[PDB]
């Protein structure tokens, strides 16, 4: 038989504990890509991001090295990877890879150049910007990185060109959440320490979100609970009834905030502009209270008065007004 | 003894580590189905699907022939599965398979037909359409797939003629959520780059829901929170107690779409036509909140005008009901 | 010593990777029972359920065999599980088993009758009937099942006789959610296709829920929310708020609804009646407010006739409410 | 050298599968205790308990036997738990071990007595009581039980006086949820048949909640819930505006109860105390509400009889107010 | 070959089930620190925090010496974890350790110092601080030990420089929610019992908050639910409405508490002095209830006298805000 020959012929001796070289000052060097699939959640609160990525590695192991002659030409073959070899890498932002299935199997060649496919989802924390919320571009890190080997015994390089990592949209599931623009690969040389440089290749994936589901849901509801109150001032401020139509607003609008409020992280950097935006409205709308209270107390056992000092409270209406919808379009001219 | 003769004959030199095959430059088919169980749960926020499905393999394998002669006509045997080959096929659409448990037996023949069974729960990622919310067609896809083997090295096929499993309804779960009306196999030959060629072969399950628990609960209240203000017009729009007989619902209202904004997933192909009406519906009874609004400023220190300006308001509720009706049917008339 | 001396000469030859047996024409029977120890949760929504169960095995293996004699009288002895064969049997309901840990140790006889106990949780998946929700049987089904072998191979029976599983309340943890009346087991053949027959064996456990926690804090609330618009009837229907009396309640009881709505399955045989009932007190509520509409519109610039076409409105709730006190009895008299 | 000498001389012949004794007669007899460090958190509603505990064995094993001449007076030695024998106890009232991690070592001595320590978690299920929920006792247990084994073969013991078991607050950590009065250990003989018996030996563990946070968030609520329409009804009963004062309270007391009811379990005992006392005084407001709303049909087109038959109704209140100072006193007195 | 000629003259005999040392008196030092990457999150109703730490390790083996003579000059070398020796640490206050990936590889030297890497996540518990919520310093609490062995046998102590590990800000990841000021190690020597001693070296963790994100989105609303009602008692207290207005505030605001009550933990050494506050502004607006209702009952067939004596009720309004300026100053100059 041909091809079970070659494996006791190759595995006999393969002491897999050993990081297999000839010369040990040469540093066996691992070579890597991505594809990135999907993007399948982003949980802003939990301050993580869950990504299924292809994955694929080639590095020069010599000791794997046969001739094609007296194998019938066989230049291709499959190993379980736990009977050689493997590098350590792993992600230096993961929080739990137990969601990786195990590839059983690699390939090898004729020269050496041992290669290994697999999948791998990271739930991976990388410092999320929340700033322009419905509009935001995420600038998140995946830096593949060698755990315990240094720039002698291994070093981080890429597969292909980098600009053809960059523009990579052979496969992506569209029509879910986000869409990105492109996957930016970098080199960096890692050295926390005196005496100690750790190889590491970062992956700069940047993503940006699809607007449109909260066109309609999220800040159209945001249009008619301010329009609610313009068209809501237009009565005369003496109905006595303004009160009870003015404060079911606004209690009714604390739950506005809180139930975005426990949505979004606690990042200090700021308050999402959409977010600054509703409690802004809402802290003017707070002193319109006041004036339609005022008024009840002065028309008591200046009528005139009263409309005109409240109609300048309603020039600071659309003073707010015309100031959103200039920050909506420098938003749309973002992306 | 008969039995343990044949795995000590059989197992004594089966290097498990090589794909099995006298001649290299074949192929080593292997054909499968599936017998899909049931449907587990469809959570459309998350952008997910948990599947249970039967599951079953063949494949060729030379080495593990023998003859039924020589071991009292044996011709079934049963093999712990990490004492052979196995292909390294899984799904490219995952989550987490950590559900499924690990059968430990295998049957072979005495041609070499090894034949595996295993159950597999795959939460799958397709992207579902949620346009037409309670009666929606999902078509999922599962692609079945050699991770790392070539064409070169394994090929897929079916077990049976296709059409069976089009129509398999022989075991199912009915009465859980959904109804499937037919399972779609399809070969497809995948080939990211050049020199590589990978063997897949997809299924094109497709389900559709029961909208009867949804009939009653859902749209059914959405039923009479449009005819609570149709009727809820009849009075006269002078008794002042308008404003906040209308008010009440219309903050009211912003929570029923807010909880099921927050249900429903950002995709942004479209909100669902379902949740599309009834802000529209939302942004019709707003403008007439102004027309009970601006008929009080009128009537203030041209009556029957206002009665008939508001009139063909009215008519912009029953062209938004009768625009409804319509859209129900030709969603029924989909199934 | 004289216990090794066993083990030594036990498991010397003992191939495991075997069906144990002299003549492999007969299958090998296991034979088993459950004694079922708690029911923990039953989520209804996600229609699935979580059981511990007590479990238990035994199959006759002949090259398990000693005497007594030349071992000191040893007739029980004790072995590591995976140093033996084990059948394949697994339930075909499962959705995660991952929760039972692993008995390490097994008995021995010196018939070679080797007995297994192992404690197994299934998070199970039966389609639980939700249609009268307060004191609802269940009928939920455990299929013990050889997942690969046939009938050639292995054969499933009991272990005791089937009148002692029925009313076996030897353990038990009452004063839970749950209580069961009987545990019934019941043989079936299973064929999906020709040439093929799997050994099952199913267990049709029934249980039935402790109304008495919802008695108080469910359908109580369901009283007084019933008789508050009764007696809320009373007070003449011109008072003018009986509108700001009348709609709070009824948009309030959408939230009633929709809570449970959501807690409740998507299963299409039925709302539950329980559920289907205070729809239908809403689907009556809201045409009285109809009647308080129209009077006040006919009350403007025919009084007695008001109190009497709404009178004849008061009559259908004692219509609805003394057709609802037998659906409870009728139900009661089901347990 | 010295120590691994040893091992070599120890583990040389040490067959891990057999429960290790010179004469099988006599019972390998474990003996334990328990140290109990943390309560995590106990989830009412689930019917479950996460709890820490620090854990110790040891046991009589003969095979394992040296002299301390001969190996320069070693007499404490470590080895891996996997290459030793150890019983196969476990819990009876688990729901998921898989928190627990792994301890490789374990100690022996030149007598043979092995002896073991590890860390366990368990999410335990125990039949908690819910009567006086602020101020409830809690009768929990814990059976370590050979699982497999019978009297024969082991039987359980404990390590030190049960006494000092009992007021064991050597390590714990308060400032948490709860605090614990004793931990209490009882041996009990177990015996679900004939021609069986289970070594078990229970742990009645029992805490008690401190409820000084409660205290002001939980039922100083349910304090100006009470007085809020004690004061409510000072005012005389023909504003007609008493009802919109009143049925606001009403349906907004139902989510009071609905947000506990989905908190508490559904434990047919009973409703507990603290929630039938909420109920019942929206058992008697309720009933105010008719008697709001007869007088103003009374008062229609006997005002100082209005006042009286309703003052009685006043009678109604504090008659429940002082029944419940006592209830809360004697409460007070139990712990 | 010069690399795996080291590694079979290395591990030919290295029984790895013995804690290696030459002579046993000698305690085998292990020695680690930390470098904190990140706090990923803080829930503070579960008792736990989860903690992303950067982890580093040596100790000295006597077993894995050579020379660097005859090996080429090799000073470092890779050896797989689990073909070596591990000392049996970890911390006391896990709950589950199944998120840290498996680090297969370390380094040693030609003296023998091993050296190991691996990162670790724990989801810790450390009885969190709730007393200031936005203003909170956390004295958390990671206790690094030996399970099992004593001092005789481990030792730990640390790698560097106390002080270096106490500003360590080398590696951080900002902009989350959290930032630390330092890292304080310090050893301490446990022992519970007699006769028995075990090597532990703390580790307090302390972090505080950045209250930026609650300063908009949690206590700015606080402020304009307190200035609601000061201006709305602006009004006469004879409006009629006054109660309409002021009751919709008060069970309202039971839904502010009860949302945090259900956020925050059961701690009794406090409620929150935040949470604190809002109730204690519940226990004075609902007295003024008082003063609104019996003024009414009051004016009936001293209207001066009802506005001074309500006058002085205003002046227990800004006692309790400008009793609520120092509280936040006095927490402002905390950190
Ligand atoms: C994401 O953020 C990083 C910063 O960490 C950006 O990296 C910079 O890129 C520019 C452009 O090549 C360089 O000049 C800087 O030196 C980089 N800084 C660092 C610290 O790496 C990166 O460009 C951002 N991503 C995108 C798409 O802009
Ligand atoms: C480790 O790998 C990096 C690249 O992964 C090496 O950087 C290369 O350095 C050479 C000369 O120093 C340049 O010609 C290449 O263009 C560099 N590549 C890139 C991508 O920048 C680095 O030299 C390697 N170091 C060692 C010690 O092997
Ligand atoms: C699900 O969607 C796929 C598209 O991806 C449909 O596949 C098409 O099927 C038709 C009918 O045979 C072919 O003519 C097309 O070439 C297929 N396109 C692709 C891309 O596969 C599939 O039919 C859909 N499912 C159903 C039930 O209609
Ligand atoms: C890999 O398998 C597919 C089918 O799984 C093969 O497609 C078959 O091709 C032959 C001739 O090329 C046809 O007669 C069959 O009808 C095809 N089957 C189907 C289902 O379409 C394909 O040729 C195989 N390729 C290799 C290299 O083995
Ligand atoms: C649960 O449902 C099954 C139906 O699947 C019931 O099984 C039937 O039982 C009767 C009584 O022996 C038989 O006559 C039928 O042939 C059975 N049918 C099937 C399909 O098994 C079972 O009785 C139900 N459980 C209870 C307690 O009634
Ligand atoms: C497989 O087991 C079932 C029972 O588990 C066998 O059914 C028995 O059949 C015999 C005669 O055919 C009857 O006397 C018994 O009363 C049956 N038992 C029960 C519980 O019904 C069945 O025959 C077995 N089949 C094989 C091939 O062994
Ligand atoms: C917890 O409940 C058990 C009942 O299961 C109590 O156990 C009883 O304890 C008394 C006092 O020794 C004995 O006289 C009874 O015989 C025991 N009964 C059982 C069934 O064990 C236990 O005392 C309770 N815990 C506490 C702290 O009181
Ligand atoms: C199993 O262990 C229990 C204790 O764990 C034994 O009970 C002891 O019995 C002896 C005499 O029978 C008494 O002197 C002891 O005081 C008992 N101990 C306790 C804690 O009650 C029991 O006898 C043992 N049984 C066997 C067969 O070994
Ligand atoms: C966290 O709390 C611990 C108390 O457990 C503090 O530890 C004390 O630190 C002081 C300063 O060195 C010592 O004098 C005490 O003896 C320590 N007590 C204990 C029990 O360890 C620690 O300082 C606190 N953290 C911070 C940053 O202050
Ligand atoms: C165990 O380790 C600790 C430190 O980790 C040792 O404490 C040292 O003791 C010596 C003398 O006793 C002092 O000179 C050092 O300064 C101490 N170190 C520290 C950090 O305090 C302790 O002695 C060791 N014990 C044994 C038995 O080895
Ligand atoms: C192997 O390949 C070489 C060159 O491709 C060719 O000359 C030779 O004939 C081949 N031999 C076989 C057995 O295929
Ligand atoms: C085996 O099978 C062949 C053909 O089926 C038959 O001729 C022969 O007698 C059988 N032998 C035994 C031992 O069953
Ligand atoms: N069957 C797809 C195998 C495959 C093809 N190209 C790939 C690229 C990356 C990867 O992880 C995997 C792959
Ligand atoms: N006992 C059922 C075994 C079985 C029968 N037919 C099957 C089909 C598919 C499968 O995965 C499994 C099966
Ligand atoms: N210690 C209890 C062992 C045991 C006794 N009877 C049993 C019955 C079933 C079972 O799984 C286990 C058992
Ligand atoms: N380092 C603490 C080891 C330890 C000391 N005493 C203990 C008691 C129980 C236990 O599981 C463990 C221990
Ligand atoms: N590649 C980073 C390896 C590394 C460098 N310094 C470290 C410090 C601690 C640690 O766990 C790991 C490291």
């Known amino acids: 038989p041909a091809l079970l020959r070659l494996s006791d012929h190759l595995l006999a001796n393969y002491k897999k504990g050993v990081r297999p070289v000839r010369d040990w000052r040469k540093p066996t060097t691992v070579s890597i890509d991505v594809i990135m699939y999907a993007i399948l959640n982003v949980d802003?609160?939990?301050?993580?991001?869950?990504?299924?990525?292809?994955?694929?590695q080639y590095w020069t192991d010599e000791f794997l090295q046969w001739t094609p002659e007296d194998f019938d030409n066989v230049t291709k073959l499959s190993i379980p990877t736990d009977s050689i070899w493997v590098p350590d890498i792993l992600i230096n932002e993961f929080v739990d890879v137990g969601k990786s299935p195990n590839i059983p199997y690699v390939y090898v060649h004729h020269r050496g150049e041992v290669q290994n496919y697999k999948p791998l989802q990271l739930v991976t924390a990388c410092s999320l910007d929340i700033y322009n919320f419905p509009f935001d571009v995420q600038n998140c890190s995946?830096?593949?990185?060698?755990?315990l080997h240094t720039i002698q015994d291994?070093?981080?390089?890429?597969?292909?060109?980098?600009?053809?990592?960059r523009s990579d949209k052979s496969i992506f599931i569209?029509?879910?959440?986000?869409?990105?623009?492109?996957?930016?690969?970098?080199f960096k040389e890692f050295s926390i320490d005196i005496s100690n440089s750790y190889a590491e290749m970062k992956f700069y994936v940047i993503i940006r979100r699809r607007p449109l589901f909260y066109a309609v849901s999220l800040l159209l509801p945001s249009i008619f609970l301010m329009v609610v109150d313009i068209v809501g001032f237009?009565?005369?401020?003496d109905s006595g009834e303004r009160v009870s139509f003015k404060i079911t607003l606004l209690l009714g609008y604390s739950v506005f905030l809180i139930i975005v409020s426990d949505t979004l992280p606690a990042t200090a950097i700021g308050t999402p502009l959409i977010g600054v935006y509703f409690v802004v409205c809402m802290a003017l709308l707070v002193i319109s209270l006041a004036e339609?209270?005022?008024?009840?107390?002065?028309?008591?056992k200046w009528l005139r008065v009263g409309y005109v000092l409240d109609?300048?409270?309603?020039?600071?209406?659309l003073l707010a007004v015309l100031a959103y919808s200039i920050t909506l379009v420098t938003l749309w001219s973002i992306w």
């Open 44 to 56: 802003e609160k939990n301050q993580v991001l869950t990504t299924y990525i292809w994955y694929r």
């Open 142 to 147: 995946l830096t593949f990185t060698s755990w």
């Open 154 to 165: 291994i070093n981080i390089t890429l597969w292909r060109s980098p600009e053809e990592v």
């Open 174 to 186: 569209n029509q879910g959440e986000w869409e990105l623009l492109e996957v930016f690969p970098q």
């Open 234 to 237: 237009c009565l005369p401020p």
């Open 292 to 300: 339609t209270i005022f008024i009840v107390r002065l028309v008591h």
């Open 311 to 317: 109609r300048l409270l309603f020039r600071i209406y």
